[PDB]
Scaffold this active site. Structure first.
Site, PDB file in Angstrom:
ATOM      1  N   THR G   1     -36.666 -40.693  18.348  1.00 48.79           N
ATOM      2  CA  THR G   1     -35.485 -40.057  18.898  1.00 48.79           C
ATOM      3  C   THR G   1     -34.339 -40.241  17.917  1.00 48.79           C
ATOM      4  O   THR G   1     -34.212 -41.296  17.311  1.00 48.79           O
ATOM      5  CB  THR G   1     -35.113 -40.654  20.264  1.00 48.79           C
ATOM      6  OG1 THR G   1     -36.259 -40.635  21.119  1.00 48.79           O
ATOM      7  CG2 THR G   1     -34.017 -39.849  20.929  1.00 48.79           C
ATOM      8  N   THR G   2     -33.519 -39.213  17.729  1.00 43.69           N
ATOM      9  CA  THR G   2     -32.282 -39.351  16.974  1.00 43.69           C
ATOM     10  C   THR G   2     -31.224 -38.520  17.674  1.00 43.69           C
ATOM     11  O   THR G   2     -31.304 -37.291  17.673  1.00 43.69           O
ATOM     12  CB  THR G   2     -32.446 -38.900  15.533  1.00 43.69           C
ATOM     13  OG1 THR G   2     -33.533 -39.612  14.944  1.00 43.69           O
ATOM     14  CG2 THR G   2     -31.198 -39.220  14.765  1.00 43.69           C
ATOM     15  N   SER G 130     -34.212 -44.269  17.732  1.00 40.46           N
ATOM     16  CA  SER G 130     -34.958 -45.040  16.744  1.00 40.46           C
ATOM     17  C   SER G 130     -34.725 -44.530  15.334  1.00 40.46           C
ATOM     18  O   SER G 130     -34.895 -45.280  14.370  1.00 40.46           O
ATOM     19  CB  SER G 130     -36.446 -44.995  17.068  1.00 40.46           C
ATOM     20  OG  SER G 130     -36.945 -43.682  16.911  1.00 40.46           O
ATOM     21  N   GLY G 131     -34.355 -43.271  15.194  1.00 37.49           N
ATOM     22  CA  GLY G 131     -34.066 -42.700  13.902  1.00 37.49           C
ATOM     23  C   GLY G 131     -32.617 -42.769  13.511  1.00 37.49           C
ATOM     24  O   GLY G 131     -32.243 -42.226  12.470  1.00 37.49           O
ATOM     25  N   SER G 169     -40.810 -40.842  14.653  1.00 42.18           N
ATOM     26  CA  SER G 169     -40.462 -40.715  16.058  1.00 42.18           C
ATOM     27  C   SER G 169     -39.453 -39.612  16.306  1.00 42.18           C
ATOM     28  O   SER G 169     -39.333 -39.146  17.439  1.00 42.18           O
ATOM     29  CB  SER G 169     -39.920 -42.035  16.582  1.00 42.18           C
ATOM     30  OG  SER G 169     -40.929 -43.024  16.554  1.00 42.18           O
TER      31      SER G 169
END
Lengths: 196, 207, 242, 221, 204, 234, 198, 206, 214
Positions: G1-2, G130-131, G169
């Site tokens: 996810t970002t 997470s990114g 991710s």
């Protein structure tokens, strides 16, 4: 471990049990009756952990004695077995289970003599003969060898003594003395103690 | 006073004898359990009340009759099922109880609405009870009674308490409870067998 | 006159013409207590309470008739004072649970509905009586501006430009209507709020009294404070001269 | 397990296999994996087998109570939000993996419902252990706004791609076509794999097994 | 594997206008025979039997909880239970205690009392129903009789042909299981009679 | 003692429920609602009893959801309490079911709350009635009404308050000759209804009008100058 | 996810990817991680795909009922404080990292970041998922003060595309959203419309 | 907190003649990541008590609204009684001890500074309810990197001025920036006096 | 038993409802008048479904009916979750009449001013019951409640004959409401619900107008 045994004949439910209660390596009591009488014609041989035996068997003894007071007539040995099995089963999913291995034995005026078996998980099984403890591993095959269904009560005492002499010869624990009693149609007598 | 159920004890069975009361013509003649409510495999009952408060009192007796069987794996003795409801009514309808157990044999009871029961050899509850309690006390051999002799007494004392000109052969609900081959049989008797007892009474009492 | 039927023994019972008397009896304790007024200006909200003193032994500051229910809201009560201290403690807990959940100061249109639905909720059941206290609530903020609401014992909550509660609420309102308060500033109405109190005080019947004043507005950064001993003494001199 | 769904401009086509396994041995060869919820919303099911059955039945009763009370056909977003607010409450301790799909007054809607309570509205989802094998067919041969028979050939090829490639999948293909008008619950849709006809003859003759005792109980008619 | 603490081997098989349920007779602690006369098949109607394997104390608990719930059903409704409904009555009895289950996996086998159509079923330990047209098995030796019943089951069998098929499948499966055996009991449920046969088996 | 709680009369009447309808007439006001072919309008009296009232805080029209409007007639404190349940039950429907509550199911929710006041003796009925207006997704405009008894019927046009019976006869007569309305000239039907029976029609800042339409489903209270346009043309 | 939110003068600019994984399999590749909390308030969901949906649907209920009572469009600070009190009470049972951006008339465009643990802080631009770790250096370098609406969109879309290229991710398509007084403008960048940096 | 997520680091504190100065850096670490670089970890409790905290910054934002509302609640009833710095310190000891006894601690470590009734107060509260008062406090790695620098000056010179203890804190911030990996360039010193709590701006080490 | 006798006064003041059990079906016909033309005739419904196969109509108080129609729907789905079969009509009325009895029993709560007529279909045999506010329930062949139900039950007893089909029972049910209507019944003034092997459904008003041509 403590030792129980029962031999059902045509009209008697001969049971025996050791008279030893042990802590770690010593043994504390040399005459310890593990048999609890519930009616005039039924018993309950209870072994298992420390504490859970005298808390469960006294619970079953007074609730079956409560049945005689409320009604005048006592429970049948079959209904006292299922009453014992009912309480032990539905408490093993609770926070406080019991680790008692039972051997219930009674006589009925109509259905006849009866010996019952249950483990600590409360799986009731009616058997012609049954035994508990580590000493059951030795003594069931003397009983599988020499038990006829129509064995006399004097040939059942000598069948009992063959099993107990096997514990003297082969079993590692010192089980010197045994309480022996018969459950014929006249109630619970008490035979002489088999000792070595 | 609504029902007219009556019990009679014999040497080889007990019998309830209730009358099917139908007020309006447009009431549906139900083909379900009408008047004699079977409690477990060896005990039946009958109430002196409306069929809605019957379904509360009988389905409470059936909880007691099966909480016993779950606990002891034996059928309930036919006084403890009477006693356990009489303890519930002690904390509003009268009943009868026919049944068999291995302790005191064939049994008949009568629960008061106050919570009191009693073992009767024959009794009545409901509509015109004391008219038929007195008629049973006239003619009941208290010990020398066969089942068919008890069964002829039932349709005798029902021909003097209910209805007109036919004893309501399609509206009387005799059930007998007997022992046969070890098990226990509850026979709600059929309409052909209930009609012939009216025929065997109207022939014997006219002659 | 009297009624002997029990249509006025509970607030859970309507009268046969559609009145709840136990509510209408509860706003007789308010209609008999001393007068509390509150006037809103172009820059804030000023309260003023005719506080009757009942014994010379009581210390100056006893029976505080101007409460602080949040750091931006005030409260001027009438009626049965013991019930007013319980609706002060409910209005504080409602204002406290708003900041604990939403994270800012509670608006006054919403505080005076959470409280007004607490007052209403005791006008429904046979186990509790309605409150014997009307009261006012005034705040000021950059967002909402100045606001003044009043809550009756029935639970109705309206917003006012000027308000009066107490036994001279009729004579006080006709003095507040003489004011044209939408153009006046907050310091100029403390002269006028204290003026209306000394007018409507019946010094023949009521023996003696203190004067409580408290503003909330843009001249103290939007917090509710008691008017200091200098500005309250000047307004008590401009009134008693008038 | 291989369950899938697709949207075909007129509704939803739901597919499922029929092999139920207890370990790595096939228990039932004709299991049913597409479940009823409402007369316009069905729901394929993977995951724990009892946690799928007793959950979709619970939603089908809680949404019939919603259906009779509103008096109109239920919406698929209601069946989504009944499921995701229930599965989240149990925190994933009931393994319900669902391919909820149906046609309401807003149109065709299809949802994938994961056991922790996350939902996702896609034009095509697959769940189960053969789910990765069946997204191979949907990522290759799906185009938006298909026809009915074109979509059924897509979902049947997707479930068959899970039959011939996953060990815990097989034995038949169940289909379910929902539109605004009809509902084709096609229970033996495609039989790719059949049992082979046996060559030998192993029939137990009468009298082979000896018996110890025999009690015969006649029953009334 | 707590369901191998007592063994257990129960199997049902559907025939034409009849069913057959069969089980073994052994009651054992882990590897120790206690009795040879342990009941695993319980009457739940006129012609409707349930068979329970698994932990032997839940063989006796679930059979008594169900007979508790069946006698309340058979008296309130005023009729005998349909076999498809007893399936769901067990499926609600087992799923109610899900988080901590009854360690049994019951198979039921009976006849529809208004249609006399054959019905057999099996349930997981947390109550997942499973209606098959051929056969269902349950117990410690499950794979041994999975293989004996896709070799011997043919459709539309006579009751004397069904009895050989289910008994020859029980005997050859419990002989390849150590903890299941000590005799096999077979019930053949037909339209007009119930024939209960216990049959000669290897006593280990 | 069967007049001081909500239990039956020997004739089978609930007297406190009947007395609760008399509590609606104590407010001295009257509300009129009317349904169009594509619109739904509510019209009240807005009495400003004190000159010191902030008139923005005196209203009886309330937003329940973004596209369900209300009008409360009766005891004002009971009215704000029954808005608060409609505010709650309409947002609880959106969280449990994922779509906007109908005006069907919001009246049936509110009236089922109001029935409990008419059966438990420990609480009085609310002396106020709710008229909910809103646009359905598939049925068009809806104008419903709850009462203190618990009845939730659907309406072509309705009334409430002191002039309820007199306003009904004005709305019955227009709903028989024609289709009772057309589009947003339906506003002109309701304002004449409240002005005929009350016999004042003094100013265009003494009423309050709210609408929902098909082309704009959200509930929007008309302003003073927006409501002067319908009154200068009246 | 970002996920990413950037504040400008007059509103905010949002951004997220569209990939939800289950470990190393992409279960959904067209996810919508921009959920409307109110008409001019969004949240960006990152972390547990079940926790962030069950929190955002509860705050949409809690803020929607708060807003109809007050009869005002609700504050973006009020919306994030509902996320704060939700994420703080249940952080022993959530993995929800949220950044909340929206508009309200009292203080304009606002960006609040509620990470795991449920603290709340107003940032000029917030990044999450997470990114987000792969683009801290990029967004701290080229963030001007006072960028326009069109300039914050390219700053969000470049910074998401840089993290989608590096994070496994992350990935998919870019979902952007601009919230101002006029309303919400949503655009989806797919294919060669997404920026490539070589 | 059962696992801290966004943590603070060393909060100093030293009492002088007529007041207390504490300081903390403006940084929250998400596990060796300088993630939030403009946060204030020093609270103005009321006019005579100030409070800074290490540990989890989300738990500290909970204590800013519990202890913050509690200060407002005492100011409403207007009795003239405020909470003393010993009162907040003794309240906060009971709050942190009650949370470890539920096995759900607040992962913080507070420094309560305060000047009231002509006494400087400086109190330490851990996440275990460990509480004491000292002439110098430092939580975190300031207990190793700065508490030696505070105890050496306070033994030779037992009473400091305001400027003596201010430069002493800034000497200890620079050691913390050089030798604590979780520390940060920008910090802020807040000071209580007989005038009140004054938090200073983003001071930088150099 | 005082309030229970007074709740039956609220039933007998209510609108007429007629139920007739035919050979292959059950018909539930009732009165749905509106006081004005302002009332939407199709907004609320009196004949109301419980299951796919059970519907029930009332005579008495409107809002007290909805409490019983909300509990009867729960009690029908609490059966279906457990037993996975549609609930018997006999077993549904036992549970609904236990709910109606439960408010007579507890104090401070008045009884329901509602009698119910509960149709149904089980095992190929029709069912028609009637639950009273007392908690009593009776199985009927044909009955009526509401205004002039004494005249209704005597009217039904002359025109009942158990060999009639379901289409013949819809006529003799509307003819029973015809005797105590006092007006001109359109398709909107009455509500009819039929229950057969196909299940329960209330008749659409265009379907009723075919029966009103008799």
């Amino acid at each position: 471990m403590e030792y129980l045994i029962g031999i059902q004949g045509p009209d008697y439910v001969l049971v025996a049990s050791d008279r030893v209660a042990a802590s770690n390596i010593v043994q504390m009591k040399d005459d310890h009756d593990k048999m609890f009488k519930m009616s005039e014609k039924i018993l309950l041989l209870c072994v298992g952990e420390a504490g859970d035996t005298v808390q469960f068997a006294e619970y079953i003894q007074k609730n079956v004695q409560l049945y005689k007071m409320r009604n005048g007539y006592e429970l049948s040995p079959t209904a006292a077995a299922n009453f014992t099995r009912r309480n032990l089963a539905d408490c093993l999913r609770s926070r406080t289970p019991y680790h008692v291995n039972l051997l219930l034995a009674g006589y009925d005026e109509h259905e006849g003599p009866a010996l019952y078996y249950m483990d600590y998980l409360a799986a009731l099984a009616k058997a012609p003969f049954a035994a508990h403890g580590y000493g059951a591993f030795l003594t069931l095959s003397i009983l599988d060898r020499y038990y006829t269904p129509t064995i006399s009560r004097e040939r059942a005492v000598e069948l009992l003594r063959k099993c107990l002499e096997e514990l003297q010869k082969r079993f590692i624990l010192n089980l010197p003395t045994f309480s022996v009693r018969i459950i014929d149609k006249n109630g619970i007598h008490d035979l002489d103690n088999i000792s070595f | 006073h609504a029902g007219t159920c009556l019990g009679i004890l014999a040497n080889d069975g007990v019998l309830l004898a209730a009358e099917r009361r139908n007020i309006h013509k447009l009431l549906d003649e139900v083909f379900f359990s009408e008047k004699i409510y079977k409690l477990n495999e060896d005990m039946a009952c009958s109430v002196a009340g409306i069929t809605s408060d019957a379904n509360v009192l009988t389905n409470e007796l059936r909880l007691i009759a099966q909480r016993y069987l779950l606990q002891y794996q034996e059928p309930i003795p036919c006084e403890q099922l009477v006693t356990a409801l009489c303890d519930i009514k002690q904390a509003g309808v009268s009943l009868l109880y026919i049944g068999w157990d291995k302790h005191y044999g064939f049994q008949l009871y009568q629960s008061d609405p106050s919570g009191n029961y009693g073992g009767w050899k024959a009794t009545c509850i409901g509509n015109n009870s004391a008219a038929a309690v007195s008629m049973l006390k006239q003619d009941y051999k208290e010990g020398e009674m066969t089942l068919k002799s008890a069964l002829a007494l039932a349709i005798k004392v029902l021909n003097k308490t209910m209805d007109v000109s036919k004893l309501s052969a399609e509206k009387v609900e005799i059930a007998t409870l007997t022992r046969e081959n070890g098990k226990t049989v509850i026979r709600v008797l059929k309409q052909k067998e209930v009609e012939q007892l009216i025929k065997k009474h109207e022939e014997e009492e006219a002659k | 006159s009297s009624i002997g039927t029990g249509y006025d023994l509970s607030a859970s019972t309507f009268s046969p013409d559609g009145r709840v008397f136990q509510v209408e009896y509860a706003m007789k304790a308010v209609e008999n207590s001393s007068t509390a007024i509150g006037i809103r200006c172009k820059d804030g909200v000023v309260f003023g309470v005719e506080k009757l003193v009942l014994s010379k032994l009581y210390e100056e500051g006893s029976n505080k008739r101007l409460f602080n229910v949040d750091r931006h809201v005030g409260m001027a009560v009438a009626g049965l004072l013991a019930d007013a201290r319980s609706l002060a403690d409910i209005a504080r807990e409602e204002a406290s649970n708003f900041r604990s959940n939403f994270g800012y100061n509670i608006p006054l249109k919403h505080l005076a509905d959470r409280v007004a639905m607490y007052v209403h909720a005791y006008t429904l059941y046979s186990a509790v009586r309605p409150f014997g206290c009307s009261f006012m609530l005034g705040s000021y903020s950059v967002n909402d501006g100045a606001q003044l609401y009043m809550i009756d014992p029935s639970g109705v909550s309206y917003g006012y430009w000027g308000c009066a509660i107490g036994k001279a609420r009729q004579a006080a309102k006709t003095e507040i209507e003489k004011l044209q308060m939408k153009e006046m500033t907050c310091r100029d109405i403390v002269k006028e709020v204290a003026k209306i109190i000394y007018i409507v005080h019946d010094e023949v019947k009521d023996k003696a009294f203190e004067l409580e004043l408290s503003w909330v507005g843009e001249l103290t950064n939007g917090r509710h404070e008691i008017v200091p001993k200098d500005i309250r003494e000047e307004a008590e001199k401009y009134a008693k001269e008038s | 397990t291989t369950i899938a769904g697709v949207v075909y401009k007129d509704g939803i086509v739901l597919g499922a296999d029929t092999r139920a396994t207890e370990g790595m041995v096939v228990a039932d060869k004709n299991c049913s994996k597409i479940h009823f919820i409402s007369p316009n919303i069905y729901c394929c099911g993977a995951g724990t087998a009892a946690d799928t059955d007793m959950t979709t039945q619970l939603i089908s009763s809680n949404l019939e109570l919603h259906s009779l009370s509103t008096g109109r056909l239920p919406r698929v977003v209601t069946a989504n939000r009944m499921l995701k607010q229930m599965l989240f409450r149990y925190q994933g301790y009931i393994g319900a993996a669902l391919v909820l799909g149906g046609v309401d007054v807003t149109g065709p809607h299809l949802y994938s419902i994961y056991p922790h309570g996350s939902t996702d509205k896609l034009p095509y989802v697959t769940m189960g252990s053969g789910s990765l094998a069946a997204m191979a067919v949907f990522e290759d041969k799906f185009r938006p706004d298909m026809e009915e028979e074109e979509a059924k050939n897509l979902v049947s090829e997707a479930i068959a791609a899970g039959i011939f490639n996953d060990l815990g999948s097989g034995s038949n293909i169940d289909l379910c076509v929902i539109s605004k008008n009809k509902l084709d619950f096609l229970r033996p849709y495609t039989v790719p794999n059949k049992k082979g006809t046996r060559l030998g003859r192993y029939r137990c003759e009468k009298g082979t097994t000896a018996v110890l005792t025999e009690k015969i109980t006649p029953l009334e008619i | 594997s707590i369901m191998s603490y007592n063994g257990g081997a129960v199997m049902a098989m559907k025939g034409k206008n009849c069913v057959a349920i069969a089980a073994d007779r052994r009651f054992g602690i882990q590897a120790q025979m206690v009795t040879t006369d342990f009941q695993k098949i319980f009457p739940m109607g006129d012609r409707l039997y349930i068979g329970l394997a698994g932990l032997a104390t839940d063989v006796q608990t679930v059979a008594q909880r169900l007979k508790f719930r069946l006698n309340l059903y058979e008296l309130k409704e005023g009729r005998q239970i349909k076999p498809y409904t007893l399936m769901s009555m067990v499926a609600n009895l087992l799923y109610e205690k899900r988080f901590g289950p009854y360690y049994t996996e019951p198979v039921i086998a009976g006849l529809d009392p208004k249609t006399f159509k054959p019905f057999i079923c099996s349930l997981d330990l947390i109550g997942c129903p499973m209606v098959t047209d051929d056969f269902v098995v349950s117990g410690t030796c499950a794979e041994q009789m999975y293989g004996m019943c896709e070799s011997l089951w043919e459709p539309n069998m006579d009751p004397d042909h069904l009895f050989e098929t289910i008994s020859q499948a029980m005997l050859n499966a419990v002989d390849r299981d150590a903890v299941s055996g000590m005799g096999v009991i077979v019930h053949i449920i037909e339209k007009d009679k119930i024939t209960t046969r216990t049959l000669k088996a290897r006593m280990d | 003692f069967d007049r001081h709680i909500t239990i039956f009369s020997p004739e089978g009447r609930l007297y406190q429920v009947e007395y609760a309808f008399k509590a609606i007439n104590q407010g001295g006001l009257t509300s009129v609602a009317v349904r169009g072919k594509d619109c739904a309008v509510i019209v009240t009296q807005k009495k400003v009893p004190d000159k010191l009232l902030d008139s923005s805080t005196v209203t009886h029209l309330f937003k329940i959801t973004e596209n369900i409007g209300c009008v409360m007639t009766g005891m004002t404190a009971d009215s704000r309490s029954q808005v608060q349940r409609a505010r709650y039950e309409a947002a609880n429907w959106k969280y449990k079911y994922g779509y906007e509550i109908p005006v069907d199911m919001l009246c049936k929710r509110i009236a089922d709350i109001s029935q409990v006041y008419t059966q438990n003796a420990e609480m009085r009925p609310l002396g106020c009635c709710m008229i909910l207006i809103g646009i359905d997704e598939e049925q068009g405009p809806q104008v419903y009404k709850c009462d203190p008894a618990g009845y939730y019927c659907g309406f072509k046009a309705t009334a409430a308050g002191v002039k309820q019976t007199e306003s009904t006869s004005f709305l019955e007569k227009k709903v028989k000759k024609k289709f009772d309305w057309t589009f947003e000239q339906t506003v002109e039907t309701a304002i004449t209804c409240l002005s005929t029976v009350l016999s004042i029609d003094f100013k265009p800042s003494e009423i309050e009008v709210g609408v929902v339409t098909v082309e704009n489903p959200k509930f929007r209270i008309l302003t003073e100058a927006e409501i002067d346009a319908h009154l200068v043309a009246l | 996810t970002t996920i990413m939110a950037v504040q400008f003068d007059g509103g905010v600019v949002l951004g997220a990817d569209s990939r939800t994984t289950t470990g190393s399999y992409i279960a959904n590749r067209v996810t919508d991680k921009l959920t409307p909390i109110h008409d001019r308030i969004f949240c960006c969901r990152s972390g547990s795909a079940a926790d962030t949906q069950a929190v955002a649907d509860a705050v949409t209920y809690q803020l929607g009922f708060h807003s109809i009572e007050l009869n005002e469009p609700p504050l973006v600070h009020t919306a994030a404080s509902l996320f704060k009190e939700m994420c703080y009470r249940y952080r022993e049972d959530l993995m929800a990292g949220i950044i909340i951006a929206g508009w309200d008339p009292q203080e304009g465009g606002q960006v609040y970041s509620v990470p795991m643990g449920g603290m709340m802080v107003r940032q000029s631009f917030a990044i999450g998922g997470s990114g987000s770790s792969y683009i801290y250096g990029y967004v701290d370098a080229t963030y001007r003060e006072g960028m326009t609406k069109e300039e914050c969109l390219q700053f969000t879309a470049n910074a998401l595309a840089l993290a989608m290229e590096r994070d496994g991710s992350s990935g998919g398509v870019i979902r952007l959203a601009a919230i101002a007084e006029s309303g919400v403008e949503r655009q989806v960048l797919l294919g060669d419309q997404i920026p490539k940096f070589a | 907190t059962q696992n801290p997520m966004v943590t603070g680091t060393s909060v100093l504190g030293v009492k002088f003649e007529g007041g207390v100065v504490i300081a903390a850096d403006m940084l929250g670490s998400y596990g060796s990541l300088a993630r939030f670089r403009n946060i204030s970890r020093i609270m103005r409790v009321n006019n005579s008590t100030m409070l800074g905290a290490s540990g989890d910054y989300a738990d500290f934002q909970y204590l800013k609204q519990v202890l913050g509302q509690m200060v407002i609640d005492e100011e409403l009833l207007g009795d003239g009684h405020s909470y003393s710095p010993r009162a907040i310190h003794s309240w906060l000891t009971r709050a942190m001890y009650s949370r470890r006894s539920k096995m759900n601690p607040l992962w913080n470590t507070m420094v309560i500074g305060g000047y009231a009734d002509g006494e400087s107060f400086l109190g330490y509260v851990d996440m275990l309810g460990v509480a004491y008062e000292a002439p110098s406090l430092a939580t975190g790695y300031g207990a190793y990197l700065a508490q030696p620098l505070l105890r050496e000056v306070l033994e030779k010179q037992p009473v400091l001025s305001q400027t003596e203890a201010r430069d002493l804190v800034e000497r200890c911030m620079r050691v913390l920036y050089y030798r604590d990996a979780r520390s940060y360039n920008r910090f802020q010193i807040a000071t209580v006096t007989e005038k009140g709590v004054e938090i200073e701006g983003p001071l930088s080490t150099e | 038993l005082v309030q229970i006798e007074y709740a039956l006064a609220a039933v007998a003041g209510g609108a007429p409802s007629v139920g007739i059990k035919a050979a292959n079906g059950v018909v539930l016909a009732t009165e749905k008048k509106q006081k004005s033309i302002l009332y939407d005739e199709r907004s609320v419904h009196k004949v109301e479904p419980i299951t796919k196969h059970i519907g029930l109509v009332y005579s008495g108080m409107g809002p007290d009916y909805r409490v019983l129609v909300h509990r009867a729907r729960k009690l029908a789905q609490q059966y279906y979750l457990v037993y996975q079969e549609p609930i018997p009509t006999a077993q549904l009325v036992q549970r609904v009449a236990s709910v109606m009895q439960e408010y007579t029993q507890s104090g401070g709560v008045r009884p329901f001013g509602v009698s119910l007529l509960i149709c149904g279909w089980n095992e190929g045999r029709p069912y028609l019951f009637q639950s009273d506010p007392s908690g009593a329930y009776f199985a009927w062949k044909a009955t009526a409640m509401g205004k002039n139900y004494v005249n209704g039950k005597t009217f039904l007893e002359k025109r009942y004959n158990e060999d009639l089909e379901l289409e013949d029972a819809i006529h003799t049910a509307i003819l029973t409401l015809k005797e105590s209507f006092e007006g001109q019944m359109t398709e909107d003034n009455i509500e009819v619900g039929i229950c057969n092997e196909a299940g329960f459904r209330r008749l659409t008003p265009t379907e009723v107008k075919d029966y009103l041509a008799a």
